[PDB]
Subunit: 96 residues, 2 copies
């Protein structure tokens, strides 16, 4: 069984500077183990850089958080699931 | 400034038994401190009961998670923000 990433949104398409943003990637179906990664504009997002905060709260969940938005968090956000059976993704967008 | 709860979804309206469900309540605007509570069918959700898992990952964020869905997680999910300036909420729905 390959993975399937449910749709996700920031609850918005734009947000002010200094405000918080949060998105939730959920993979309820797909063979384990699962690789779940976040990227902004086709560049990887790492826990503890550029104001990001990644939290694998579950083997099937990966929350991304931003505590203080700025002009470098604007763009396209993607969450890619991967297992040996295949890959799956979903895309969102955000401006500031 | 009263709170404003951004729209949120489970990424779906139905899910199979034994699967995981996850929803994210975000309150990027509104005076602090903020009270954020989850309920299912107008009944409060508590961290560590009925298969639920609440995680105040932030002062402006409250993720709800379910690790093994069953026939008692079906219904209407609500996330209510509260400060001395007022309240705000958003509603989602889920069946199994």
């Amino acid at each position: 069984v390959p993975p399937q990433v449910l749709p996700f949104s920031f609850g918005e398409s734009a947000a002010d500077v200094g405000d918080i943003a949060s998105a939730n990637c959920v993979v309820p179906k797909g063979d384990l183990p699962l690789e779940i990664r976040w990227s902004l504009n086709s560049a990887p997002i790492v826990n503890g850089e550029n104001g990001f905060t990644l939290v694998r709260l579950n083997k099937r969940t990966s929350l991304l958080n931003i505590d203080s938005l700025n002009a470098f968090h604007r763009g396209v956000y993607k969450c890619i699931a991967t297992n040996p059976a295949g890959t799956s993704e979903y895309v969102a967008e955000l401006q500031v």
